[PDB]
Amino acid sequence: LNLDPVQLTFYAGPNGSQFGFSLDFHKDSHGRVAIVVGAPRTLGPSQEETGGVFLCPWRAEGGQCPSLLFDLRDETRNVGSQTLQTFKARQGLGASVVSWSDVIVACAPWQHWNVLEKTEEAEKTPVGSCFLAQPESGRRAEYSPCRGNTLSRIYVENDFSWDKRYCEAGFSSVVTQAGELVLGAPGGYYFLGLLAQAPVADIFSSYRPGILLWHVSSQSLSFDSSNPEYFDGYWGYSVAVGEFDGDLNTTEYVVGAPTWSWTLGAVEILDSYYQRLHRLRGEQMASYFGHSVAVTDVNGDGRHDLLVGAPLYMESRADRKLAEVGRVYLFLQPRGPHALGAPSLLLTGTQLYGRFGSAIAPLGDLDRDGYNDIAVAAPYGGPSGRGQVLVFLGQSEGLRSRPSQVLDSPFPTGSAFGFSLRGAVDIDDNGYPDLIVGAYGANQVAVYRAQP
Amino acid sequence: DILMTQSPSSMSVSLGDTVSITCHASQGISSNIGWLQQKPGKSFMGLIYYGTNLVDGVPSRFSGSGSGADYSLTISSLDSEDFADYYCVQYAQLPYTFGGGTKLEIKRADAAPTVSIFPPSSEQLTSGGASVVCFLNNFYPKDINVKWKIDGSERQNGVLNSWTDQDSKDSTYSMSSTLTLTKDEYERHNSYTCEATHKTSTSPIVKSFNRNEC
Amino acid sequence: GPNICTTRGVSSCQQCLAVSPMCAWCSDEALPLGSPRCDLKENLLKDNCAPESIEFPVSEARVLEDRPLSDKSQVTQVSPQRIALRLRPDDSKNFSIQVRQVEDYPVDIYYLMDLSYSMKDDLWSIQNLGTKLATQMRKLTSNLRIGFGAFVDKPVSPYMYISPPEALENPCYDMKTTCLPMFGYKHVLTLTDQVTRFNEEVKKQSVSRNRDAPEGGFDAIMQATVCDEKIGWRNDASHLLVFTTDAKTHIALDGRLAGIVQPNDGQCHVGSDNHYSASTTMDYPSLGLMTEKLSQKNINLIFAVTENVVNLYQNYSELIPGTTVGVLSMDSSNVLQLIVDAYGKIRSKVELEVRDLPEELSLSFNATCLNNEVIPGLKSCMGLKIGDTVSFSIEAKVRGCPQEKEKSFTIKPVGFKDSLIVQVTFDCDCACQAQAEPNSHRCNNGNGTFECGVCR
Amino acid sequence: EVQLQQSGAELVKPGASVKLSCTASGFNIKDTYVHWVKQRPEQGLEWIGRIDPANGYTKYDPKFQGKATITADTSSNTAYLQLSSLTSEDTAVYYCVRPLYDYYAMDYWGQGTSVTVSSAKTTAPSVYPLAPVCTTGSSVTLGCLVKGYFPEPVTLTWNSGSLSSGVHTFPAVLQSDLYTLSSSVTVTSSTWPSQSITCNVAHPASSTKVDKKIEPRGP
Ligand SMILES: *[C@@H]1O[C@H](CO)[C@@H](O[C@@H]2O[C@H](CO)[C@@H](O[C@@H]3O[C@H](CO[C@H]4O[C@H](CO[C@H]5O[C@H](CO)[C@@H](O)[C@H](O)[C@@H]5O)[C@@H](O)[C@H](O[C@H]5O[C@H](CO)[C@@H](O)[C@H](O)[C@@H]5O)[C@@H]4O)[C@@H](O)[C@H](O[C@H]4O[C@H](CO)[C@@H](O)[C@H](O)[C@@H]4O)[C@@H]3O)[C@H](O)[C@H]2NC(C)=O)[C@H](O)[C@H]1NC(C)=O
Ligand SMILES: *[C@@H]1O[C@H](CO)[C@@H](O[C@@H]2O[C@H](CO)[C@@H](O[C@@H]3O[C@H](CO[C@H]4O[C@H](CO)[C@@H](O)[C@H](O)[C@@H]4O)[C@@H](O)[C@H](O[C@H]4O[C@H](CO)[C@@H](O)[C@H](O)[C@@H]4O)[C@@H]3O)[C@H](O)[C@H]2NC(C)=O)[C@H](O)[C@H]1NC(C)=O
Ligand SMILES: CCCCS(=O)(=O)N[C@@H](Cc1ccc(OCCCCC2CCNCC2)cc1)C(=O)O
Ligand SMILES: *[C@@H]1O[C@H](CO)[C@@H](O)[C@H](O)[C@H]1NC(C)=O
Ligand SMILES: *[C@@H]1O[C@H](CO)[C@@H](O)[C@H](O)[C@H]1NC(C)=O
Ligand SMILES: *[C@@H]1O[C@H](CO)[C@@H](O)[C@H](O)[C@H]1NC(C)=O
Ligand SMILES: [Ca+2]
Ligand SMILES: [Ca+2]
Ligand SMILES: [Ca+2]
Ligand SMILES: [Ca+2]
Ligand SMILES: [Ca+2]
Ligand SMILES: [Ca+2]
Ligand SMILES: [Mg+2]
């Protein structure tokens, strides 16, 4: 209701870099808020696409940002009569970026990997990898839990079980408050999908350069399955964390599986051991129910609610005609040991091909009335199709059906305005939480300040 | 198989010294080398992995260096705890191969041995055997040779030898040398001699007894 | 009292006919001068005028060409084909015409072959199905045109095996066998009436290989829909797009696993080499976008999928109205019936258009369609199947007497090669005018000529 | 705290087989490769092989192919080394090893397991006192000879451990299936023989304790 749309700040990256594909607020040990931006098609130092990360400091005027530096050199290690190989060309560094304390974790989901042993090989495949940075010290670490040294043949002999060769780890990422990094790997287990968890501290302390295959003892990966419902489900396309079992001493994981059960889609709430606690099923096939997942208490009762996005949902219209507009589903958490029932509210897009629900950002309390608010992206919405982000204020009954405010893309056609979003952080120190919106198509980020 | 030649096999050094152990591979092993430590009687502790990375908990004074086929472990300012055996292992190829080892030894001034010859006890002579024991004690450095003579002639077959480790107090070495022969023969000869040769002298230390002479 | 024949100058037999079509002329010289010569034929016969002397033309319409309507080379759809009308001043005449839809309805079938490795065992099935569509639908309609293309998936990691280097040319490298290089969508053969050729090319096809079970056939569907000139769909023709596969299908937003985030623009990107050039840069289409272009380009999608996935594609079908599903198998009956069933629903019209109709001639029509009701002033019937016959009754009215004397026009149905050529002669003179007799004889004052009992 | 706990010492007969064990503590045995290494005083360290207990796959140095079989069991969190066709060359200390971080490294080690291949029967030692020969200097060295015992160990002390300083008990040596050991003690000449000095040998395998007072040699 109170994001100023006239007073904007534009941060810009280089052409064709997809600067703004992903972003997050980052806070240094001093307390100063900055904006980390991911640019998955940034040219490396030898004019080949490697992707890149930028750390933007808060300015009213905005402008260009400094490049958070990472090692873009490929690595080879001949060890144990094998040849380990990393390939960073077209790895998409900054396809996702997340911050926690004084660390930043930017991932390259399509970083390739191979192992050669005489005439045989593991196969050159996109295991993915995450680069971890600590700006104020300069420390760097990596985490690539899907790398292996198993030759192609052995997977065939074992019916492709425990096949992590195509994980694309870091496709999605989130960090718990304790400092456990959780990665989405929708290619995991032959495109079932998987999650890999590891304490940020333990990643840093077990990493050394040039090793390539190393053990992070405290890590916890999810499991493979031979249940056809999970096949090609992309479980981990999106990921999130929250509190859904009443016990504050444990953390629950929210996983999006948008093509689960023959493209029906699903989202699951799980414990830290990856035992399923609940499963929400998609309403309509190919709608990509699970593309987005957001956790926030919107009705002021202290229990986290779940928001799921299905951006390709087709709405029914006059004379049996369908219209792709996109849909967001709200699930308010009830009291005690009781499952998440049917949706408390359905929000549906209005523009054809608008992809409403492509991103869902908890805004915190935008108007400081007590109830938390959210932002929902329609990257190709608005009458022109340039994009649109819609604010929804929270209330006792959940959310409002009608949006409180509508942000129209200031960038030209194709920008994907709203493809990325983040809030709940006060960047200018005025008491109200703000919103950063990414337009990778236009290589920019728009910062909207909340005002009284 | 890759051969790991380690050097030196031993060195005599002092507390506070900075020392280096080299280790040479028969082909290049691109830093795929580990360094190990074995203290007297104890088991193994990993010191360095992948050439230069210290294992968790290993003290600052240990460091690794080198590349290709030639690597070095360096201990700076030796602690008394650092007098032990050290080995390199390569894991560039299967099978993993180890170095010969390098033993850090406590340096001290040269000392000649205290040689003492003992004839067969009455108990042993009654039972039918006859062993002549000779102790060469508290000497430095460790290399020493012992010779046995019966009535002037050198006796080689039937000698057993044992050496202690470097002493915990005075850092010296001791040897024991037992000549065993049939009682039958023992009583057929008179003079029994035990000659210790050691770098502390050009001429050997001779100790003898003549059978039944009191 | 008096009629228009008698009381309008009438100095001659020619002017007499020119006055009105109901006028007659008495040439009988035995008639007294008091009696009028230009009058109604009843009035003449009432006044003792010789029956043989009465000049009273009657307009007619003889059939010149009358080949019957065809059943099942020549193929006659209009009958009669040639008529000879003969008219007198201002007079009109009518005639019949029958039109029948004999020739078969035009149908386009484009065939999409899943040639991924999972279809190795299903290859004979899709080869059998293709050639059966070709041959059996040719028997159903001689105006069939048929073509095909193949698809695998986006030739990009992780879908494509990208190692070792040999695997790019031969994806089956690590199986110690050979298969073709991977590809997104290949247009292979444009919609053609050459069935024997289509079957040969279809039987030549072989499989390729890719990493993941869901394939990129929806790209092929989109491009086969929107690439008009490449595929060759005809404007006035029934469009069928048969889609074969034994597995799941990639859908919009799957592309992000290959680093592809650009939404499908719905435009054609095939061009010269017959490959879908956007395969590695553009995302798969969404069901809505597919629906839009299928509807816009007027194409009926048919999923011909194997039994393990029928339920998947039946469910997609309900999200794309007008789509239908048949089972791909060793037997081609299920799928063929869908096509016959579609052909069974086709209905045509008969809409008469006139060409070269002279300034003077004006027409009016009576339509007798399948309801067997004479709808007056109507010249078109709608809702015909092959074998149906409608009928029209046309009346032509000439304006007076033209100087041309012999013209022709053509009544033709829209979309038919067949037509009716109607030849029109204008009969303005009298038979007694030939017997001119140049000399006056009776006048003898330099008047000249004496025809049908008159000086001038 | 990561720790590899190996099974106790083995006294095995030639031609027989033996199976050593190595149990994970403070971690799971499937976490990494587990290796087995052989040590001997003369020949040194030899790598036998490895296993990936997650899936059972193993590697061996051709030297130990056939003799050595490495297995593991994730239920009991233990890895095993089985040696068949035992020869005297198999007498050695055997260690299990795993890496800290680097997949391929050799960082954490067990305490080792001793294996002695022998046909020898249990035999109690003959213990002989060694008094000096017939002038006397400032000091005097005595000795004790322990011969023909099996198996190791014996424990030797002087005056029941009261005389610990100035002692040299030498490591045992093998000859013809049986072990021999000797010890020496030195004192000032005023100490001995005026005060009594006895040799105490104890061989638990044979249930034998012998005391030998060193007596001066007479006429
Ligand atoms: C397309 O189809 C239509 C429908 O059949 C057809 O219409 C005919 O057109 C011709 C001329 O082109 C008409 O001919 C004229 O007829 C006039 C007399 O018509 C009257 O009488 C008719 C018969 O009455 C009896 O029978 C009927 C049932 O059969 C019954 O209802 C009556 O009670 C009675 O018993 C009667 O059908 C007709 O009714 C039609 O007309 C009236 C008036 O407009 C209308 O209101 C009605 O709704 C109905 O449509 C009417 O009552 C006659 O006077 C006339 O003669 C003059 O002109 C001719 C030259 O054209 C001169 O020669 C003559 O000297 C006169 O000056 C002329 O003969 C015929 O009547 C039509 N028939 C019908 C049923 O409408 C078209 O021809 C068809 N076209 C083609 C190309 O095929
Ligand atoms: C294509 O689309 C069809 C139609 O939607 C799918 O088939 C349906 O699949 C759903 C699963 O989502 C089925 O739902 C389940 O129904 C079970 C019993 O249904 C009976 O009654 C129906 C009447 O409508 C009959 O059609 C049917 O034959 C049965 O007699 C319930 O037992 C299930 O409940 C359990 O699971 C759900 C989670 O889904 C839990 O919430 C429940 O607590 C419980 O554990 C469930 O409701 C449905 O029956 C199917 N319909 C039909 C008509 O077959 C296909 O799966 C789909 N195929 C593909 C390839 O996409
Ligand atoms: C047989 C695997 C090689 C794939 S292929 O050569 O047959 N190429 C196919 C695509 C395909 C991919 C996967 C598949 O099933 C893979 C099943 C593995 C499922 C996993 C899921 C996690 N649990 C372990 C098994 C079948 C076909 C082509 O048509 O080009
Ligand atoms: C990038 O190119 C665009 C046009 O393609 C041009 O307008 C501009 O000069 C460039 N923009 C930046 C930010 O470098
Ligand atoms: C929380 O529970 C975990 C086990 O899930 C346990 O390890 C830990 O001790 C608990 N924490 C506290 C603070 O009690
Ligand atoms: C056509 O007109 C003629 C008169 O020339 C008449 O005999 C006939 O009945 C009419 N037929 C139709 C169908 O109008
Ligand atoms: Ca909890
Ligand atoms: Ca709530
Ligand atoms: Ca609020
Ligand atoms: Ca603010
Ligand atoms: Ca098949
Ligand atoms: Ca595929
Ligand atoms: Mg296939």
Smallest CA-to-CA distance from A130 within A239, A234, A57 is with A239
Query: In terms of DSSP H, where are the helices of A120-186?
Result: 152-157
Residue D133 and residue B95: Cβ atoms within 8 Å? no
Structure tokens that stand for C271 in this block: 């061009």
What is the rounded distance in angstroms from the CA atom of residue C319 to the CA atom of residue C21?
68
Q: How much distance in Å is there from the Cα of A394 to the middle of ligand 8?
A: 10
| Domains assigned to chain C | 1-57 (3.30.1680.10), 58-101+347-456 (2.60.40.1510), 102-346 (3.40.50.410)
C188 Cβ neighbours under 8 A, 6+ residues apart: C147, C148, C149, C150, C201, C205, C274
SS3 C342: helix
Locus of tokens 């299920």: C334
- Side-chain-side CA neighbours of C179 within 13 Å: the count stands at 23
- CA separation for the pair A287, A313 (Å, rounded): 4
In order of D63, D80, D207, the CA distances from D21 in angstroms are 21, 5, 29
Which residues contact residue C59 at a Cβ distance below 8 angstroms, ignoring those fewer than 6 apart? C21, C85, C86, C87, C88, C91, C92, C93, C427
Interface contact A79-B53, CB threshold 8 A: no
A18: exposed, middle or buried (C-beta count within 10 Å: 0-12, 13-18, 19+)?
A: buried
CA–centroid distance, A364 to ligand 8, in Å, is 13
| Residues sharing a CB contact under 8 Å with residue C239, sequence separation 6 or more, in sequence order | C108, C110, C233, C297, C298, C299, C300
Cβ neighbourhood burial of A177 (10 Å; 0-12, 13-18, 19+)? exposed
**Subunits close to D (at least 3 CB pairs below 8 A):** A, B
How many A from CA of A355 to the centre of ligand 12? 25
Backbone angles phi, psi at D58, to 5 degrees: -130, 160
Tokens of C241: 């797009």
Extended strands (E) in A72-201: 75-79, 82-87, 96-100, 103-108, 112-117, 120-121, 129-134, 139-143, 172-175, 180-185, 194-199
Contact residues for C139 (Cβ-Cβ < 8 A; gap 6+)? none
Rg of chain D's alpha carbons, rounded to an integer?
23
A292 close to A272: Cβ distance less than 8 angstroms: no
- Lookup: tokens for A228: 């056809």
User: D31 near A215, Cβ under 8 Å?
Assistant: yes
Cβ(A249) – ligand 5 distance below 6 Å: yes
CATH number at residue B8: 2.60.40.10
Using alpha carbons, list the distances in angstroms from residue D144 to A344, B31, B118. Answer: 93, 52, 10
Reference A365, options A357, A356, A353, A373; nearest CA is A373
In order, the DSSP letters of chain B are ---EEEE-SEEEE-TT--EEEEEEESS--TT-EEEEEE-TTS-EEEEEETTTEEPTT--TTEEEEEETTEEEEEESS--GGG-SEEEEEE-SSSSPEE---EEEEE----B--EEEEEPPPHHHHHHTEEEEEEEEEEEBSS--EEEEEETTEE--TTEEEEEPPPPTTT--EEEEEEEEEEHHHHTT--EEEEEEE-TT-SS-EEEEEESS--
C-alpha–C-alpha distance, residues C77 and D184, integer Å = 133
Resolution of the determined structure in angstroms stands at 2.9
Indicate the helix (H) or strand (E) that contains C196.
Answer: helix C195-204
Q: Tell me if C92 CB under 6 Å of ligand 6.
A: no
For residues B174 and B162, give the distance between their C-alpha atoms in angstroms, rounded to a whole number.
Answer: 9
Strand partners, B11: B104
DSSP C249: B
Contact C231, C187 (CB under 8 A): yes
Whose tokens are 């045989």? That residue is: A120
Q: Do C212 and A232 touch (CB under 8 A)?
A: yes
Question: Which chain B residues are within 8 Å of A208, Cβ to Cβ?
Answer: 50, 53
Contact state of B96 with D172 under an 8 Å Cβ cutoff: no
Are B66 and B48 in contact, with CB atoms under 8 Å apart?
no
Interchain contact A118–B (C-beta under 8 A): no
Q: How far apart are CA A1 and CA B8, in angstroms?
A: 78
What DSSP element (H or E) covers C393? Answer: strand C389-397
> Quick one: CA dihedral C126, C129, C133, C134, positive or negative?
positive
Q: Kindly state the tokens that stand for C364.
A: 């009016």
CA dist A48 and D205 (Å) reads: 74
Angstrom distance (rounded) from CA C243 to CA C250? 14
| Amino acid letter, A344 | S
Number of Cβ within 10 Å of residue B158's Cβ equals 14
Are the beta carbons of A314 and C287 separated by less than 8 Å?
yes
Instruction: Give Cβ neighbours of residue D47 (< 8 Å, ≥ 6 apart).
Output: B89, B95, B96, B97, B98, D35, D36, D37, D38, D61
Q: In the Cβ-directed half-sphere of C72, how many Cα atoms lie within 13 Å?
A: 14
DSSP state of D64: G
Interchain contact, A232 vs C157, CB within 8 Å: no
Q: Which residues line ligand 4 (CB under 6 A)?
A: A 12, 15
Task: Report d(CA B201, CA B196) in Å as an integer.
Answer: 10
Query: Which class for C285: exposed (0-12), middle (13-18), buried (19 or more C-beta within 10 A)?
Result: buried
The token pair at D143 is 């000795």
Q: Looking at the structure, tell me whether residues B137 and B207 fall in a common domain.
A: yes
How far is C-alpha A277 from the geometric centre of its chain's CA atoms?
22
C303 contacts in chain A (CB < 8 Å): none
Residues 6+ apart with CB under 8 A from A319: none
DSSP line for C18-46: HH-TTEEEE--TTS-TTS-SEEEHHHHHH
> Structural domain tally of chain B?
2
Q: What does the alpha-carbon distance between residue D133 and residue B134 come to, in Å, rounded to a whole number? A: 12
Measure Cα distances from C199 to A325, C42, C122, C194 in Å.
Answer: 43, 76, 17, 9
Answer yes or no: is the C-beta of C395 below 6 A from any ligand 1 atom.
yes
Q: At what angle do helices C195-204 and C123-140 cross, to 10 degrees?
A: 170
CB A247 within 8 A of CB A239: no
Residue A316, Cβ density class (10 Å: 0-12 exposed, 13-18 middle, ≥19 buried): exposed
Whether C376 lines ligand 1, by a CB cut-off of 6 Å, is yes
Whether A225 contacts A207, CB under 8 Å: no
State the nearest Cα–Cα gap between D175 and chain B, in angstroms.
Answer: 8
The answer to whether A314 contacts C251, with C-beta atoms less than 8 Å apart, is no
Say whether B50 and A81 touch across the interface (CB within 8 A).
no
Contacts of C171 (CB under 8 A, 6+ apart): C117, C160, C161, C179, C180, C181, C182, C208, C209, C210
Counting as contact any 3 or more CB pairs under 8 A, the partners of A are: B, C, D
- Closest CB to A217 among D31, D103, D104: D31
Q: Are strands D113-117 and A139-143 parallel, antiparallel or unpaired?
A: unpaired
Q: Is the CB–ligand 1 distance for residue C59 below 6 Å?
A: no
CA–centroid distance, A451 to ligand 10, in Å, is: 7
Cα–Cα dist B179/B193, whole Å: 10
Which is nearest to A264 in space by CA: C316, C214, C323, C291? C316
Q: Does the distance separating the beta carbons of A78 and B92 come in below 8 Å?
A: yes
- Residue in the structure block whose two tokens are 């209701």: A1
Fill in the amino acid letter for B2: I
Chain A residue nearest residue D28, CA to CA: A217
Interface of D with A in 98-117 (CB under 8 A): 99-104
**CA nearest ligand 4 atom 7, residue:** A15
* Cα D14 to Cα D12: distance, rounded to the nearest angstrom: 7
The string of DSSP codes covering C108-153 is EEEEEEE-SGGGSTTHHHHHHHHHHHHHHHHHH-TTEEEEEEEE--
Q: Do chains A and D touch (3 or more CB pairs under 8 A)?
A: yes
Ligand 3 pocket test, pick from A123, A160, A191 with the greatest ligand atom count within 8 Å of Cβ, gives A160
Domain hosting residue B130, numbered range: 108-211
C373 lines ligand 1 (CB under 6 A): no
DSSP assignment of A1-48, as one string?
--EEEEEEEEEE--TTS-TTSEEEEEE-TT--EEEEEEETT-B-TTSS
Residues of B67-102 as b/e, b for ≥16 C-beta within 10 angstroms?
eebebbbebeebeeebbebbbbbbbbbbbbbbbebb
Phi, psi (degrees; rounded to nearest 5) at B141: -80, 180
Go through chain A and tell me how many residues it has: 452
- The verdict on A76 touching B (C-beta cutoff 8 Å) is no
Residue A103's identity, in one-letter code, is V
Q: Tell me the fold of D1-119.
A: Immunoglobulin-like (2.60.40)
Structure tokens at C104: 């078969």
Residue C330 annotated as lining a ligand binding site: yes
Could you give the CA distance from residue A168 to residue C412 in angstroms, rounded to a whole number? 67
CB pairs under 8 A between B and D: 135
Q: In what helix (H) or strand (E) does residue A261 lie, and over which residues does it extend?
A: helix A260-263
Residues B119 and B184 in one domain: yes
Looking up tokens 């309805």 gives C105
* Separation of alpha carbons C413 and C97, rounded Å: 11
Closest CA to D79 of D63, D105, D58: D58
For D100-162, give the DSSP string. SSBTT---EE---EEEEE--PPPBPPEEEEE-------SEEEEEEEEEEEBSS--EEEEGGGT
Do residues C240 and C107 touch, judged by C-beta distance below 8 A? yes
Q: Determine the residue of chain A that is closest to C315 in CA distance.
A: A285
Span from the CA of C325 to the centroid of ligand 2 (angstroms): 21
Ligand 1, atom nearest to C376 Cα: 1
**Cβ neighbours around A424 below 10 Å, total:** 18
Domains of chain D, by residue range, sit at 1-119, 120-214
Taking residue A334's Cβ as centre, other Cβ atoms within 10 Å add up to 13
Spatial CB neighbours of A69, under 8 Å, sequence gap ≥ 6? none
Is the CB of C393 within 6 Å of ligand 1?
Answer: yes
| D168, D173, D179, D181: CA torsion to nearest 10 | -10
Question: Could you tell me the two tokens for C145?
Answer: 């045109």
CATH homologous superfamily of A1-452: Integrin alpha, N-terminal (2.130.10.130)
Bridge-partner residues for A321, per DSSP?
Answer: A317
Q: Would you identify the CATH topology of the domain D120-214?
A: Immunoglobulin-like (2.60.40)
Determine the residue of C395, C397, C411, C422 to mutate for testing ligand 1's pocket, defined as the one with the most ligand atoms within 8 A of the Cβ atom: C395
The encoded tokens of residue D101 equal 């971080």
Question: CB distance from A210 to chain B under 8 Å?
Answer: yes
Mutating to test ligand 4, I would choose from A10, A15, A17, A411 the residue with most ligand atoms within 8 A of its C-beta, which is A15
